[PDB]
RNA sequence: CACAUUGCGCCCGCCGGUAUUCCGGCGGGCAUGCCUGUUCGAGCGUCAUUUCAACCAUCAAGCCCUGGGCUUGUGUUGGGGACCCGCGGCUGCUCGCGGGCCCUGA
């Protein structure tokens, strides 16, 4: 991987995204809810990794976490959802009182698995939860049963799939819930939000969301460098002996190659 | 109950006489219509009765550089959209495998 050809590939892709939005739309009617600064700031940039064989024998619904130097979901206009285990009362008081003001404004809804199976069963109900929140975090005790509850709506698109979080200390619900120290739960939640997620879909092609078009190319290139060097360290089998060329992918534009 | 005659039934209990059975007496009760409630019922009057529930891991095990992190626990309704891709075949058009966006009452 040559960083100079990678970073010069970054400028060409963000520049084309800017000009692609800069063209007047040919229908003669403007958009009320799409400004130029808004639509560039909200288009995500993908990097697509292809392999010589299957990266996994079967679908792994639980996504892995990639530690980034810069957090990914950092904008103000994102709302997160926390799927907890039992006592939602215990964890809603946790958010409301002993959390920082930044974390409280990030949290949109804390929901226990029992209430999730109680009022999100219809596909219309879980579609409304899908559209309402931006990202989803979920307990490690509960990540087993989310595909049955959330259904096809969350687990066919691989974009809002729930991110695991570890509420492991080392069960009667109302007696005592096994909760870790509170201020370091916030660091774990902040770690999950800022991480870029990998999806171990069985086929040869995987795509990672790494940044946005309004970000600087230096901060984009630094993010993708640690992503591609650390993802194939643990997730891709046979290390480079399975990997093939990379492609930086815009959502509506062509793919720029990075061969390996 | 009976022109009411000091007569005669029925239920429970008691007393005195050779008395568990007999005789006589005594005490408390037994009219009709209607109301409220209790209890026992009757009706080829009407109804219900073939259980659409919950029931994965609200944590276990193995590890590492002794305390935090890691790995495994395979679990998704169907359909549609001159949209953007990667990979396999197809002489090629294209078709399969997985993605990015959008829509719809399970």
UniProtKB/TrEMBL annotation:
Protein's name according to its UniProt entry: Uncharacterized protein
Organism whose genome encodes this protein: Chaetomium thermophilum (strain DSM 1495 / CBS 144.50 / IMI 039719)
Stretch of the intact protein here: 18 to 295 of 391
